[PDB]
């Protein structure tokens, strides 16, 4: 239905908006681009599923996210990746970890204040119908 198409369009608009607000925050600049594969060759095989906010925006546009649940799974992945790759006690790693927990916490906070639970539920019930 056109009504279902319209619902998924509203979700994409919503997710693009959350993602943009993350990507323009100076704290989250490191998470806006893939890890350059030369600058860092070991990334690839330490991190099984790389993920960044640019990839998130491409996945939105390719209609990969049918629920906010699915989108927050990728944000959790950016955070978990950052914590796993940068575990050390040194200030370099600790700043990334702090920033990666802040990205996570900010995304969940935006969604908690701005996503209608009835919109998320609709999205889940359409998704379940596929």
Question: Footprint of ligand KVZ on this chain (CB under 6 A)?
Answer: 30-31, 33, 35-36, 39, 52, 78, 81-82, 85-86, 96, 100
**Closest distance between ligand KVZ and the C-beta of residue 89, in Å?**
16
Question: Minimal CB distance to ligand KVZ: which residue?
Answer: 82
Nearer to ligand KVZ, 47 or 115 (CB): 47
Nearer to ligand KVZ, 37 or 61 (CB): 37
**Closest distance between ligand KVZ and the C-beta of residue 93, in Å?**
9
Inter-axis angle of helices 91-114 and 68-85, to 10 degrees? 170
**Closest distance between ligand KVZ and the C-beta of residue 53, in Å?**
8
Closest CA to 96 of 13, 20, 14, 40: 40
- Residue 91 C-alpha from the chain's centroid: 24
What is the spatial distance between Cα 127 and Cα 64, in angstroms, rounded to a whole number?
A: 12
Nearer to ligand KVZ, 10 or 41 (CB): 41
What is the spatial distance between Cα 16 and Cα 21, in angstroms, rounded to a whole number?
A: 9
**Closest distance between ligand KVZ and the C-beta of residue 51, in Å?**
7
Nearer to ligand KVZ, 84 or 114 (CB): 84
What is the spatial distance between Cα 112 and Cα 110, in angstroms, rounded to a whole number?
A: 6
């Amino acid at each position: 239905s056109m009504q279902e198409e319209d619902t998924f369009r509203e979700l994409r608009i919503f997710l693009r908006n959350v993602t943009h607000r993350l990507a323009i925050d100076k704290r989250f600049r490191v998470f806006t681009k893939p890890v350059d594969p030369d600058e860092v060759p070991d990334y690839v095989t330490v991190i099984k599923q790389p993920m960044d906010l640019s990839s998130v925006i491409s996945k939105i546009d390719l209609h990969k996210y049918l629920t906010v649940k699915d989108y927050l799974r990728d944000i959790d992945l950016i955070c978990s990746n950052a914590l796993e790759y940068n575990p050390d006690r040194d200030p370099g790693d600790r700043l990334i970890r702090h920033r990666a927990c802040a990205l996570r916490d900010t995304a969940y906070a935006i969604i908690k204040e701005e996503l209608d639970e009835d919109f998320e539920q609709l999205c889940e019930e359409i998704q379940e119908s596929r």
